Subunit: 243 residues, 3 copies
């Protein structure tokens, strides 16, 4: 690939060189490798989490008794685990021959944590088997280890899918980069109150923005529009996961 | 381009290898080729199809008498053909010297069909010369041949522009990949009722999400913001095509 | 990278070859170089410019007396200069060793101008030191020189960040390409009246669509969600820049 020509940046004013941490560098190399290997598409959707939110907030007592804080992330993790089992193509990777998919029968899910030194993506194993407060507690433990640089490589391996959550900061949508050899990544942005038409008038519903980026060699657009659609349905009524 | 390192995925759980159809593989190779050759931008827009819809639905009788089903796709196809003639840069391809555009004086348009074996994009020739019920009928014939694997290569060649429609499934917007050597692709997502300000109060209008991805070497951003804008205008009043 | 196979386009109809200007070609080569080097993410946001607009429109008299026309671009330029100093990572470039950032202590900002021959991006130097009517006047001078092909290379060098504005044409959002070796680019689309919930009811606020694309090797997603968030806040009350 052509390189970018070097520029004497100090011609224009005062410059200062600050160096990258090895995590940045590792991170930089991996994203570039994914960017060049994966033909990326992003499918955007909005889920009505009006009732999910009222549940989350009413279980605050139980959550405080268990020592966990229940945010939207354990709820996303449960729903995606369920879906990764209903739509296995999303749970798989392109074999190195380029002529097969390796379907994973397990569901481990990574989530992006933002630390001073760079990005880490700890993995929760067998997300499909834990409950909302287990996932709540583990998510929190892995994030504090990540931030403390006390997270060990054992816990950043073997993920099938990644959730990248910026809802705590802001934003309307974004287009995340697939962590190859995974095939998809859900980005989550900030929930807003919005008018949603009911057939007769607009009702304020609390809408969660979802951005699913995917590897188009493996996933075609209708399958991904279908994934986001089912996720939007599961989050509108999480009791459907009981069925 | 660096490859992605192989991972023993079976360390983490049970795996199963399922193979890709030759269509997937063909598809995979082509998208990767487009991804690396085309600097992609996506321009998003929403068109008010409140009146277009009421027309579509009122002509249901005529459509049933002709045996066709009239969806939004023949209407998109007519409007894009008209526009591909008003803005010829969108109707062209970058010559292999890299120093010229080959302007096509014809309008043939492909549309993405989703089949069990992978994606096919049949082509309707001379879209600019057929009527809404001709395009309606041909679209339907080509899609059933595509699904029946009875579509023959003659009909997947010489397209100038592609429409990729997921409105039947869901979604807010997405970023399609340009089918090189074409220069643009319109993605269409699901229409929603939305509040649109009239100067004094918000009115429910039925809004169609459009995502136009384009080859930025050939098309600059203002030309594409202008294409989506004119398309939004043509769909708001399709009688302007008579002018 | 594999090339795209040549197609005899004249099999399908009449073709015409028209050639690219040297600006297109230069432009084409640079975008391709950026596309392959930068792993791109776009973060979308909306800023409430209801009060900013009423200010802009009330200062029309002062502006007419100074000979300038004050649009939203000098206001974007001031706010981004302020922010490029609060968040210096956005004001920097990846050193050629790939292991350091070169932090620029200056703020010069480029803006995309659309001319018949192709795209030019003149640079305003030391944006952080000029006022709204200085930036208003210079922006206008550089754009008319650009359009007159009388802009000279001196003025297209040493930029730290680019603003690409299509608000004058239309569109909901788009994903611009980073001008390497810069690390981010703000795209601006058309402002719309929109319902924004106040805790009790929806209020029409005039919303500006922002699309920030960035070089993910250098900028991680939470930093960019934070940049767009602060910009949305500065534009909601530009007096915060006085603080
Ligand atoms: C650890 C975590 C992954 C997840 O955090 P979390 O458990 O959702 O929440 P948190 O950080 O504790 O913040 C929680 C508050 O914000 C709220 N919030 C979280 N998601 C929200 C959403 N999507 N919408 C609105 N509000 C949200 C929580 O519900 C919570 O409310 P209270 O303060 O009232 O309890 C996140 O802190 C993080 O670091 N994200 C970084 C992701 C990233 O950097 N991606 C970059 C790569 S881009 O390809
Ligand atoms: C054949 C077709 C292209 C087009 O189908 P179509 O003719 O528009 O409609 P359909 O499939 O018959 O479904 C029609 C129903 O959904 C509705 N629908 C279609 N577009 C709609 C839209 N954009 N918004 C809302 N509803 C829509 C129709 O109007 C119709 O309504 P009724 O059932 O009441 O008549 C589509 O079936 C298909 O396979 N699309 C796949 C595209 C794709 O996979 N892209 C992937 C690559 S991503 O880069
Ligand atoms: C010179 C300029 C950069 C900026 O123009 P400007 O100073 O904002 O405004 P303008 O062109 O004079 O048009 C101004 C009118 O549109 C309005 N307008 C500008 N931005 C607006 C916005 N974001 N929302 C709504 N309206 C807007 C102005 O406020 C102004 O209103 P009046 O006519 O009532 O005064 C632009 O003309 C241009 O050429 N943009 C091209 C960008 C581009 O091509 N990008 C492509 C690469 S894509 O990666």
């Amino acid at each position: 690939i052509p390189p970018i020509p070097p520029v004497d940046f100090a011609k224009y004013g005062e410059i200062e060189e600050v160096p990258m941490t090895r995590l940045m560098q590792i991170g930089a190399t991996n994203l570039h490798r994914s960017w060049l290997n994966v033909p990326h598409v992003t499918q955007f959707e909005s889920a009505d989490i009006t009732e999910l939110e009222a549940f989350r907030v009413a279980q605050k007592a139980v959550a405080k008794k268990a020592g966990v804080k229940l945010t939207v992330l354990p709820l996303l993790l449960k729903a995606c685990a369920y879906l990764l089992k209903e739509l296995p193509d999303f749970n798989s990777s392109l074999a190195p021959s380029g002529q097969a998919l390796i379907r994973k029968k397990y569901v481990h899910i990574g989530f992006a944590v933002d630390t001073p030194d760079g990005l880490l993506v700890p993995v929760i194993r067998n997300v499909d088997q834990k409950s909302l407060l287990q996932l709540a507690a583990e998510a929190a433990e892995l994030a504090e280890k990540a931030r403390s640089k006390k997270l060990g490589a054992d816990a950043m391996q073997g993920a099938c899918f990644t959730i990248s959550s910026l809802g705590h900061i802001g934003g309307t949508a974004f287009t995340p980069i697939v962590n190859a050899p995974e095939v998809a990544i859900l980005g989550v942005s900030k929930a807003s109150m919005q008018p949603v038409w009911d057939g007769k008038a607009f009702q304020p519903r609390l809408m969660l923005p979802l951005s699913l980026s995917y590897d188009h060699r493996v996933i075609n657009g209708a399958a991904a529009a279908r994934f986001t659609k089912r996720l939007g349905d599961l989050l509108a009524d999480i009791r459907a996961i009981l069925l």
